[PDB]
Symmetry: C3
């Protein structure tokens, strides 16, 4: 009774201590595990985010509210200008304009020992976009900026004449983001942007972090473009289902008309306001792989001019911190681990498997 | 002589090349190795550090030193006010008060397209703490701050009347830290804090890093609560054995009386001063697992009022960088490595071990 | 035919599926792979970068250009002063001086509850260096700075008398770097430096990152000292090969004379200007292992004085990020993987190899 019974016991022990661990290794593979590798990549040419600069929100704007109060309207019912033959929705939104046509931007990438800074005026020029904050100015910042030392920046200058006639602005909402995601400019500039003064010139410094997520089956990516498409589609469709008025405001894509009547424009504005606060929760689409983080510090550097808005965005660090999460347990790893845990507990190794198969086939 | 001698040589070689490497694998396990994995966790609700705001140290107060110089005392012998019927120890700390009773704090977490910033006035309100710097104001900042965009901050406002009668302050000592560690507020605020001006409103921006240490046998954690308990107990006990006067000052826990006499209050104050400089070296307790680093940038944003202290702490980055060091060589790993290095050099694998055991038992 | 052929096929299959994977493992070792491990090391004593503070470039000096315009020359031909008996090249470069002899630096490392800040005036004092920007001041910052709280900084003060006689400066070029690399001071201060105002006292905060590269055969290091020697030798030799004038300017090492004539000094200046822009590309030597990154934030703190230049550099974070890339595939790893992949597909394990060797030797 001793010999073969003990052999059976000691062989089933090994079989069950190998099958359990093979199941654990294959059960640790179905649940995609991800580990983050971080790197500091030195950039020769940096990818400038494309800036949107806005006035403060309509009620906080110092220029828009001036006309609104001059027409008998208050900082609340500013959408009451629409029920007026001389004021349509576009006109009311051209009132918030604080950026004269002389707005421009240049790239200062490098410095000379003789000349000074290297000025490159001919690059992506700003254009006028309509945003929940009003009529804003969008800076495409499309071409890559060659990194030459800490004095590698972009200067946005609006040289308008402050010939005192009417009250003029006090601060601007800056927003750094990516391109063709036309909901970042037109919906989320008044939420994600920095409210900074334009009384005197100011400077930013942007460091870049890049978080890359794994497109694993239990948490799928979409890519920035599809994420923006989904987010904007949800934002607009929810705004329409919530306002229950088939029309739109200047910050929305021209799907349908502008309803030049205050009552159903207030509905659209309120629906936008209460739909853009919570769309990360209520939108059924998922994390971008590439998430770009713009660590924006403020620089007390030396340059003063006599112009309305003098903005500088510095890119003085070419080392981008990239944190990428990757599948730490592949199929090759799983198969090798099964082979090791089965050859450590049984000793049969593929070749023995082939020999056994040949014996079975005789 | 050739055959079995060569067999013996070639088997002892394998045995000694396997035993040495198994010893090295088990000798690399006793010395706990730790590897750091870093992650960037996106926070939906951020954990504000609970701020302590102090006046500058007694001799640098522009208010305390005023009365001290008005009483015939100088900013040095300021503890000589205590040998007077009208001045106790607590009155001297009450003289450093620069925060009127109207001090308050609110949470601005989000922004509207219509209303503007979302104001939440009812949160953890400041209370009066006694510190080595004088009578300070402590922001409990307990409730988590829901993160809406970059414009997620807490505003601390002290709207007192600057009706010019006496000279009024110029700077304040800010200190961001954690809760119930009542030595951070009352001992180390004048050491670890930022000395910033209150001439005009200022804004802070806090990014969070979290360093997690492994509680390995040769470098044990204590956890933040136990660390604070040990540090405060050591600080106070050392202060007492160094001052050799059985009494305490307003910043100390009420273990015993206040010794209302300048001679032994100066001893306590000097002992505190020279004991809080070097307590990391002289305290026999160990690194917290969670070390919370508050990268505090200064944020030239747009908001000015007409109040004495108008401070803003911004939380514009929800991505917390967590660097956790973990045991990179576990017992499962050790056993698997021993099995691999012994099955690679001998070929015997558990199952063969059980077979040999059965053969020995017959 | 049947069973012999099947055995042949099933053994060649294992042999060719093991040889291919062993080749892939050895082909994954020749191409040195590197993985980055990141740590946050807490420093007790921090390593200050040794600062070079310069006036703005010659044509942007408001003092140098003053004398240049006062001598009938303009701020374009400032090198025409050399064609004058009273002006040599050294004198023309002593004109850019904006730092009186009273320039000094001290280390404020800690704070007292009684005294205040711990002032250590006797440290590495600044010395007068010649740089492409003019006559600059170099702060050796040699001794390590004991880190005591966030109020651990170095104050550089130039207490000169502003007795209004001639126009006085308004900006300075700061540059944080390492030591004995005498091309950082003398060539690249006007390129890598921050141009900051000296109208009122300002403060920097430096956080250190350290990127360590692996000295792999396909991308070798040189070490900071050899890298600096290579860069400076290339810069100077290229400047001479491009100017085609055998002479040098004050910022150059005293290899040969100063050629006090405007025509062949302008050539040297222009060659320097157009050679230091692009020397990373054109220099045939490679990345330092240790790359030190000085994340410089601007710090709005409270310390104002009545002196010309009052600079503070704060070191409020002792936790240094260190990202080291290491060879993730060593020879031990390669050999162990080969042994595992041939013991998993064949079952031969070293000892079997010795047995086969003995059998062959008989």
């Amino acid at each position: 009774r001793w010999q073969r019974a003990l052999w059976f016991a000691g062989v089933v022990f090994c079989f069950g201590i190998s099958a359990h661990q093979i199941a654990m290794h294959v059960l640790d593979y179905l649940s995609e595990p991800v580990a983050v590798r971080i790197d500091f990549v030195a950039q020769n040419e940096l990818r400038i985010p494309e800036i949107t600069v806005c006035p403060r929100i309509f009620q906080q704007n110092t220029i828009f509210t001036d006309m609104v109060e001059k027409q008998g309207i208050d900082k609340m019912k500013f959408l009451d200008l629409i029920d007026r033959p001389e004021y349509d929705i576009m006109a009311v939104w051209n009132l918030s304009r604080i950026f004269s046509d002389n707005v421009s931007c240049s790239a200062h990438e490098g410095s000379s020992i003789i000349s000074g800074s290297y000025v490159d005026p001919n690059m992506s020029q700003p254009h006028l976009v309509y945003t929940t904050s009003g009529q804003c100015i969008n800076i495409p910042a499309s071409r890559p900026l060659i990194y030459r030392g800490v004095n590698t920046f972009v200067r946005i200058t609006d040289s308008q004449p402050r010939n005192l006639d009417e009250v003029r602005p006090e601060a601007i909402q800056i927003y750094f983001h990516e391109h063709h995601h036309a909901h970042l400019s037109r919906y989320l500039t008044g939420l994600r942007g920095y409210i900074v003064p334009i009384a005197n010139p100011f400077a930013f410094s942007i460091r870049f972090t890049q978080i890359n997520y794994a497109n694993r089956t239990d948490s799928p990516c979409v890519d920035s473009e599809e994420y923006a498409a989904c987010v904007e589609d949800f934002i607009e469709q929810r705004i329409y289902e919530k306002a229950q008025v088939q029309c739109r405001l200047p910050y929305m894509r021209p799907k349908l008309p502008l309803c030049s009547t205050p009552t159903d424009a207030r509905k659209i504005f309120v629906a936008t306001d209460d739909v853009i606060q919570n769309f990360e929760k209520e939108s059924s689409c998922k994390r971008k792989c590439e998430e770009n983080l713009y660590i924006v510090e403020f620089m007390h550097l030396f340059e003063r001019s006599n112009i309305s808005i003098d903005m500088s965005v510095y890119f003085a660090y070419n080392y981008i911190q990239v944190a990428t999460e990757y599948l730490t347990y592949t199929l090759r790893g799983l198969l090798s681990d099964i082979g090791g845990v089965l050859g450590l507990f049984l000793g049969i190794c593929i070749l023995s498997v082939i020999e056994v198969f040949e014996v079975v086939i005789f």
